[PDB]
Amino acid sequence: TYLNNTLVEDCVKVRSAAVTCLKNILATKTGHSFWEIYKMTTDPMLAYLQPFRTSRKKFLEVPRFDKENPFEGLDDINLWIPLSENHDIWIKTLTCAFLDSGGTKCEILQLLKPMCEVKTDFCQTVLPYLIHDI
Amino acid sequence: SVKENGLEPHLVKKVLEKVSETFGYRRLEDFMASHLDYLVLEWLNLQDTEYNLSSFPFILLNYTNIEDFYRSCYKVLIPHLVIRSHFDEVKSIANQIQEDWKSLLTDCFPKILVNILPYFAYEGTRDSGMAQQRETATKVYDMLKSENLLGKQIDHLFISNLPEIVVELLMTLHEPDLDPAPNPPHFPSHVIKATFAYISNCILEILSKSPDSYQKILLAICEQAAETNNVYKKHRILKIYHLFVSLLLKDIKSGLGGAWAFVLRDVIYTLIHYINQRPSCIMDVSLRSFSLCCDLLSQVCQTAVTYCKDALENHLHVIVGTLIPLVYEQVEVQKQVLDLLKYLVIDNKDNENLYITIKLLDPFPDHVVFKDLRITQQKI
């Protein structure tokens, strides 16, 4: 829903990230588990997301690369506390560090990295889900 | 003059840096890369071994060595050589760049086909020059057909990479006034349509087989529009956008492989965004761009409402809200804004699907211009 909403923003840098995220998410186990249960309803997002989903023999798998030593990218005190100003890079760096091999068994996560890189409100929205999943 | 007149390259670099700063380019490299195709074509057109590719002045682009120059500009150097069948030179470039020549040829495929396909497309002319252009295109293409380079995998490469060829063909449009001449290709609209037809024989059906292509073409066009800070090439890219959108609308009732709703919404929102960020209305090219955007919006809205009877209820309110302020600009745009609004709300009461959409709409401003629109709104 968030990505479909942001597909119509004036800037051209979040639209490419959004379509990449749609293509990655809608080709996995959870993407189909979602489409089957959501196609029974009526919503314009069903028609808007039709092109980005494809029928492939093997559904996309996310590489669950295991870091040699986790807890190191998030133990920094400077990461967890920003300065007086410059909240955007603080939240972006925190979200990116949370996405650097730390937990996140969910497959739709680890696929929102470009959207987090290009947008800040998306980082603020997604951070609680990352913490909960970890 | 740098090559032979003896101009000192440092003074030339100083002047070029100052000029690129004046035009608003972040770096001189981007400014000189914007005209790289013309420079390389006119360099190779000088039939002399003194003016070969090695002797091309690369210091004017802030490149330290030949290797970095190739690293950065082989995407545009290779197609210019290949169309001349200088395959030994592309082999030498690959050897210098320590990359395989097959990879470079595959990565530069659409820019190669730009110089090949349109000459296949249009024939029957009495112009001899175009006849030798067609002959050169045919010989280059059949050389590429040979198994030694690209093998027989040209068909798979072509079918699996169509959007890039499509956008490269689109970016060569030049209808002809006082507009500056674009990059060398200079292909009018009809030859582009012939190229699409020729690709179809060997087009929108193939794209509809992978409905995500239209998104890629639209994204590329909008990206090249956004990176541009000028007005002339901005209007040019708007012309390409209008051409592609018109061709896409011509293929309605096919469904675009289920991609109709997304492309309709994307086009509507792109046009709305272009309209909203209007700098002013004092420059002629700005007025031409505004008129073109309004015409495209009117055409797409009319096509959607006529051949869908739906899919416009979710966009009617934003379109109306964007169009309302445009009436207080001048009569030239006022006439088209008013008749588009009249088409949307006045003569559309016969449709029950958008009856509720018009009912749940903001009232029109209480001015004389909106008198008929206000009366229709109140009645509905």
Side-chain angles (χ1 to χ4, degrees), chain A:
Chain A
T1 306
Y2 194 98
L3 294 168
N4 174 52
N5 282 41
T6 196
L7 276 174
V8 298
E9 290 188 356
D10 169 88
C11 171
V12 74
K13 304 189 58 52
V14 299
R15 274 144 62 192
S16 64
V19 299
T20 310
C21 293
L22 273 296
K23 288 192 295 293
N24 282 332
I25 292 188
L26 278 192
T28 68
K29 300 289 94 176
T30 313
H32 294 60
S33 291
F34 159 87
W35 187 267
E36 292 151 12
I37 314 307
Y38 196 47
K39 68 180 179 184
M40 291 295 106
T41 80
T42 57
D43 204 56
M45 190 176 73
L46 277 73
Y48 296 152
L49 299 190
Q50 275 280 33
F52 303 99
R53 64 184 321 280
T54 177
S55 63
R56 220 196 298 110
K57 299 175 181 178
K58 293 180 180 179
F59 298 160
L60 181 63
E61 57 91 20
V62 296
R64 270 302 306 170
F65 65 103
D66 188 8
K67 189 178 290 294
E68 175 260 331
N69 189 1
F71 312 96
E72 61 96 21
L74 292 174
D75 203 5
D76 204 327
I77 187 167
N78 292 268
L79 181 65
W80 275 95
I81 295 189
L83 309 166
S84 60
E85 57 94 22
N86 203 356
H87 156 77
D88 309 325
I89 75 162
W90 164 80
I91 192 64
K92 170 188 175 180
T93 315
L94 185 58
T95 311
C96 289
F98 264 102
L99 288 166
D100 291 331
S101 178
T104 67
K105 73 178 290 295
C106 186
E107 65 181 2
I108 70 168
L109 310 177
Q110 280 305 321
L111 292 176
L112 310 155
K113 183 74 175 294
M115 205 53 231
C116 289
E117 282 165 349
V118 301
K119 196 166 275 292
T120 290
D121 191 23
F122 188 71
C123 294
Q124 303 174 186
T125 292
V126 67
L127 178 62
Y129 302 100
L130 298 177
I131 289 174
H132 179 216
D133 193 87
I134 286 177

Side-chain angles (χ1 to χ4, degrees), chain B residues 155-184:
Chain B
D155 49 25
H156 161 232
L157 181 63
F158 184 76
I159 191 55
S160 70
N161 205 3
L162 193 43
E164 281 74 358
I165 295 90
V166 168
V167 67
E168 290 283 354
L169 283 171
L170 264 294
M171 292 301 170
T172 69
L173 181 61
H174 183 229
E175 178 185 0
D177 46 356
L178 302 179
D179 274 296
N183 262 331

Side-chain angles (χ1 to χ4, degrees), chain B residues 17-63:
Chain B
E17 180 69 28
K18 188 68 181 294
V19 161
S20 67
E21 272 308 309
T22 297
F23 285 166
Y25 281 108
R26 295 179 66 251
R27 290 181 290 114
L28 181 144
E29 312 178 341
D30 299 331
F31 163 75
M32 293 300 289
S34 178
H35 317 275
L36 198 40
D37 290 330
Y38 183 90
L39 291 192
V40 177
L41 177 71
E42 291 295 330
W43 193 260
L44 293 172
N45 265 1
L46 259 61
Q47 297 296 321
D48 197 356
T49 176
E50 183 84 4
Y51 291 86
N52 209 301
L53 187 60
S54 51
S55 311
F56 163 80
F58 63 99
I59 200 67
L60 299 196
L61 285 87
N62 287 320
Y63 286 128

